[PDB]
């Protein structure tokens, strides 16, 4: 029915905008992020006593807004489960809710209602709204990428950590020995460790500095080595991030080929098996399916030199040399 297909269209569209954004769909998630960010900022302001009544008023209003949007978010999201046999029916909606993020969405909902109803419990509930903030990335992507890259470049990272740690242990010791007496910053080796950490990371607060000439010489000498070493992981991770995401893009690109391949083989076998209602049907299916399917397959096939191009290259060449041998033995 026209109402039925309007239902289906809005169903699917809101589902996509909520669960799997893309393009302008990000505007809604930007809205939610700004909402929660505003809640955090307004809480921070409420901490500053010298002006908090205005903050409290605006915070109550913002909490109303949060309560309504989050509840509507939940309901629309659950209803937005009519795009597959997967989460349909009452039981399907229940399984959709068992999905862990829907849970914490329910908890932030009830936390909001508790806050508006109403000091440990209050701090807890507000912390739950901050839980929504950390829940922003649902499908792990920021975490999965980070862990994947850290594991992949484990050797480099462990080298950097080991040498940096060991430089930090020894430089701190030597400087502490040099300045144990005159300088008062380095009263104990703990202080020297603090200084070494602040120095090798290039933070350099300057609350703890060498004073003796020997101390300064040692500090500079070890600084060169360390400074080089603690900055290393950032470079390693940057390179690894670029590489890993490039690989993901390539891989994700290949599945785009998967659909047309099925299209072509389904059309080909069905049409061949078939070969004037029936004849008009076969005519149309031949013409439309092939002209579309072959086309799309082709525009999906060409790019990415890496290994893809050379794989097709090798395949074609292999049968070519196979037939070189075959034709030569056929001649003589």
């Amino acid at each position: 029915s026209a109402a039925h297909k309007r239902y289906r269209r809005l169903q699917n569209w809101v589902y996509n905008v909520l669960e799997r954004p893309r393009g302008w769909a990000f505007v809604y998630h930007v809205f939610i992020f700004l909402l929660v960010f505003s809640c955090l900022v307004l809480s921070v302001l409420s901490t500053i006593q010298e002006h908090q009544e205005l903050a409290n008023e605006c915070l109550l209003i913002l909490e109303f807004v949060m309560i309504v949007v989050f509840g509507l978010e939940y309901i629309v999201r659950v209803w937005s489960a009519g795009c597959c046999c997967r989460y349909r029916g009452w039981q399907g909606r229940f399984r959709f809710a068992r999905k862990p993020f829907c849970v914490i969405d329910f908890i932030v909902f009830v936390a909001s209602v508790a806050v508006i109803a109403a000091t440990s419990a209050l701090r807890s509930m507000r912390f739950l709204q901050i839980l929504r903030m950390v829940r922003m990335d649902r499908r792990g992507g920021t975490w999965k990428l980070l862990g994947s890259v850290v594991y992949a470049h484990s050797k480099e990272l462990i080298t950097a950590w080991y040498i940096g740690f060991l430089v930090l242990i020894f430089a701190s010791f030597l400087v502490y020995l040099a300045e144990k007496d005159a300088n008062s910053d380095f009263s104990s080796y703990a202080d020297s460790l603090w200084w070494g950490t602040i120095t090798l990371t290039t933070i350099g607060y300057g609350d703890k500095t060498p004073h003796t000439w020997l101390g300064r010489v040692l500090a500079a000498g070890f600084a060169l080595l360390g400074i080089s070493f603690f900055a290393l992981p950032a470079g390693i991770l940057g390179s690894g991030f670029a590489l890993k995401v490039q690989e993901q893009h390539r891989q994700k690109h290949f599945e785009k080929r998967r659909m047309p391949a099925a299209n072509l083989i389904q059309a080909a076998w069905r049409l061949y098996s078939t070969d004037p209602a029936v004849k008009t049907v076969i005519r149309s299916i031949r013409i439309l399916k092939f002209l579309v399917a072959k086309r799309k397959f082709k525009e999906t096939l060409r790019p990415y030199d890496v290994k893809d191009v050379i794989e097709q290259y090798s395949a074609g060449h292999l049968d070519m040399l196979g037939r070189i041998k075959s034709l030569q033995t056929r001649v003589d």
């Binding site: 391949a261 076998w269 061949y272 004037p276 397959f297 395949a315």
Partner: protein, 144 residues
């Protein structure tokens, strides 16, 4: 031949799958849905726009010379089908097993009938091993 001219008789009015030479995209889609195809309006439109002489649905059916006369034996077809198998032929060497064939056909893309897929596993290559040679399949579509 007889079937070609007989279908051309309907094609003269159904170049856009209707009773009159026109754009007839929606009519074509409804007719196909009655036939059981149930296509999409956008799918019909893109197709009509691509292969066309008048480029407005009411083409002077040069597809009389396309559909029947073209044996669909273009080497582009063979290369395309080989590539289509490649994405499924992990490590190649006729990698497809009939199980994978039925899996893809009945679970992905257009979910063809399991009986049709069994007929595919029979006619295309009776052996039904994990090493079904792809040259036969591209010939199977083209010549065999």
């Amino acid at each position: 031949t007889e079937e070609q001219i007989a279908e051309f008789k309907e094609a003269f009015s159904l170049f856009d799958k209707d009773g009159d030479g026109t754009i007839t995209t929606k009519e074509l889609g409804t007719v196909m849905r009655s036939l059981g195809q149930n296509p999409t309006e956008a799918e019909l439109q893109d197709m009509i726009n691509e292969v066309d002489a008048d480029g407005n649905g009411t083409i002077d059916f040069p597809e009389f010379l396309t559909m029947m006369a073209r044996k669909m034996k273009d080497t582009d077809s063979e290369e395309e089908i080989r590539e289509a198998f490649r994405v499924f032929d992990k490590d190649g060497n006729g990698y497809i097993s009939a199980a994978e064939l039925r899996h893809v056909m009945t679970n992905l893309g257009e979910k063809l009938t399991d009986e049709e897929v069994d007929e595919m596993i029979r006619e295309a290559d009776i052996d039904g091993d994990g090493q079904v040679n792809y040259e036969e399949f591209v010939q199977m579509m083209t010549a065999k």
